[PDB]
UniProtKB/Swiss-Prot annotation, chain A:
The organism's taxonomic lineage, starting at the top: Eukaryota, Metazoa, Chordata, Craniata, Vertebrata
Residue range from the parent sequence: 1250 to 1466 of 1466
Localization annotation: Secreted, Extracellular space, Extracellular matrix
Name this protein carries in UniProt: Collagen alpha-1(III) chain
Domain notes: The C-terminal propeptide, also known as COLFI domain, have crucial roles in tissue growth and repair by controlling both the intracellular assembly of procollagen molecules and the extracellular assembly of collagen fibrils. It binds a calcium ion which is essential for its function.
PTM characteristics: Proline residues at the third position of the tripeptide repeating unit (G-X-Y) are hydroxylated in some or all of the chains. O-linked glycan consists of a Glc-Gal disaccharide bound to the oxygen atom of a post-translationally added hydroxyl group.
UniProtKB/Swiss-Prot annotation, chain B:
Function recorded in the entry: Collagen type III occurs in most soft connective tissues along with type I collagen. Involved in regulation of cortical development. Is the major ligand of ADGRG1 in the developing brain and binding to ADGRG1 inhibits neuronal migration and activates the RhoA pathway by coupling ADGRG1 to GNA13 and possibly GNA12.
Domain of life, source organism: Eukaryota
Protein name: Collagen alpha-1(III) chain
Full-sequence portion shown in this chain: 1251 to 1466 of 1466
UniProt binding sites for Ca(2+): 30, 32-33, 35, 38
Pro-sequence residue ranges: 1-212
Cellular location(s): Secreted, Extracellular space, Extracellular matrix
Disorder named in the UniProt entry: Ehlers-Danlos syndrome, vascular type: A severe form of Ehlers-Danlos syndrome, a group of connective tissue disorders characterized by skin hyperextensibility, articular hypermobility, and tissue fragility. EDSVASC is an autosomal dominant disease characterized by joint and dermal manifestations as in other forms of the syndrome, and by proneness to spontaneous rupture of bowel and large arteries. The vascular complications may affect all anatomical areas. Polymicrogyria with or without vascular-type Ehlers-Danlos syndrome: An autosomal recessive disorder with a highly variable phenotype and onset in early childhood. Disease features include cobblestone-like malformation of the cortex, polymicrogyria, intellectual and motor developmental delay, small joint hypermobility, vascular fragility, aneurysms, thin translucent skin and easy bruising, congenital heart defects, and foot deformities. Early death due to vascular dissection may occur.
Amino acid sequence: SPDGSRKNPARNCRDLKFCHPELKSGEYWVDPNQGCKLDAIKVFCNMETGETCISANPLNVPRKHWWTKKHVWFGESMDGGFQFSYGNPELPEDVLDVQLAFLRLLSSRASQQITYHCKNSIAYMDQASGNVKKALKLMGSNEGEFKAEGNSKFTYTVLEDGCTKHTGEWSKTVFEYRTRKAVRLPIVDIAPYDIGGPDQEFGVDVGPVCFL
Amino acid sequence: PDGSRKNPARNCRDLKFCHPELKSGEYWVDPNQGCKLDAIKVFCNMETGETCISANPLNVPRKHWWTDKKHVWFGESMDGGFQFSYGNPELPEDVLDVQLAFLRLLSSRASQQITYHCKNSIAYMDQASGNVKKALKLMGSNEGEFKAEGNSKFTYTVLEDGCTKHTGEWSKTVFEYRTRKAVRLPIVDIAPYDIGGPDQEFGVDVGPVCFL
Amino acid sequence: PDGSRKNPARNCRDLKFCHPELKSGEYWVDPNQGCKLDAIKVFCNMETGETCISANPLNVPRKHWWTDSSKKHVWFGESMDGGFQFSYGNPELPEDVLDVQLAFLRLLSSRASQQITYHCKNSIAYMDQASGNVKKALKLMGSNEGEFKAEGNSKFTYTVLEDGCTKHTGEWSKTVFEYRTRKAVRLPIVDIAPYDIGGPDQEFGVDVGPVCFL
Ligand SMILES: [Ca+2]
Ligand SMILES: [Ca+2]
Ligand SMILES: [Ca+2]
């Protein structure tokens, strides 16, 4: 019987939760495509919810002046930019793709949080206008974009917003996207709008993509 | 496996292939495999290999449901209405969701029948006018509707039609939707058109959704 | 699993991952897992790790297929006398079982690709040398309710590997098409619709290449 060890992975964390109810939240190995056990992925299992959470690698975009107004994709367009990747970096992309496809099928929903660190850079709401027209965008895995407004199937939610004014200091805004259409996740890129001025800087902490 | 609760099969088609001696009946299957605890109870047709899952409740009682012509969704709009639900109402809705998702996305084909019980209510053909303009509609599981006419991908077929006149008596019309795109099934709602008058009544018997 | 009939692998990519010493060739795989008995014999490209399933039948004979008495695309399978849609896998297995094995590969692979060859006599396949344009290019039917074309939405355009059909010369030639995608439910190709057909001197045939999943 699977037990979530590297040599004996479970199919996902929900299976571990139910078939091994004594296990606590933490690091486990899961193998959504089953078959060959060697392409298993290392995850965090939330044993309260049954969520399988896969970390981004790299987890973070360092705080820097990145760009010198329009939305600009970090991965697509910025110098030193990269798109976000998930799961054991040593695994071929196609294998990671297949694992995510199976985990999507195994799950009712997926969610992900992302943190925008800001210095003189609006992320969501602009305190002066009270509007979100300068809000950043996120790119999903199905080419779709997650936005502040527009099609309600694709809008993100904001959990805290410390970036509403240029204060010369660092703060942060936290975004979440949650959906039943798990093909849309994980987030692969980010496009700030209020960037490019000499004293504007940002960083990013990419939260894990969680499936249940 | 063998189709018992302790040893469920992936689905009925596998059970037929691997155990051709088994007769049609109740079995336990586990489309998402892995941990066996979320296996579901189904009817296996062992001649076709179909996995058939019953609605629960499967019956809409015969009643005057609507008072007021236009299509009106039973589940969406009528007092006491409900959308049709499938599987062991014991398991959480999200578990059944995933098990059904495996069947909907990875089956060859699917089919489902639904029976409209009618008193003074046209269901498909209107004998007096000679047309199907008053025909009812059905709602699938992929935000699509099944109709008497229009896009031939989404038309249902009528197996018997006893609802063609207002006679003051009870009769029935039987609808089927069959598709190689099983994401479209099961049926989740019904919209009669010829309803609302003081002597008009209907009921429904929801047939099982069957996956190959 | 080792890719034998009694011990089929899930697919060729798993076989490669677990057995780097295995060479390209035929093996038994079982994408739907569960019962082992409905395993399918495939070609594994062990350089890429692709699972390749051959068309059966793989050939549309070379013939005058269509009589034009009207000019538009005409689907071979849907409209032509003796036409058929393309099927894949061991015809010893039930159609529904093959569909399911294919469905696992289509939904859950990273990528898919397929080539198809149009044999032509007095029949433009893609480029029309006389006009210099692709207005007469044939179309292909995918497995997800879409079509693959010379132009339009770039997600659904095919690519042309060689094009020998650009003139009417009274001689046989061929044009080879390929469709590659990260949305594998679009494949395999199930039908073909030539445009430059139906004239009294026009003929075509088709060789359907294997559908390959990663
Ligand atoms: Ca595996
Ligand atoms: Ca299970
Ligand atoms: Ca099998």
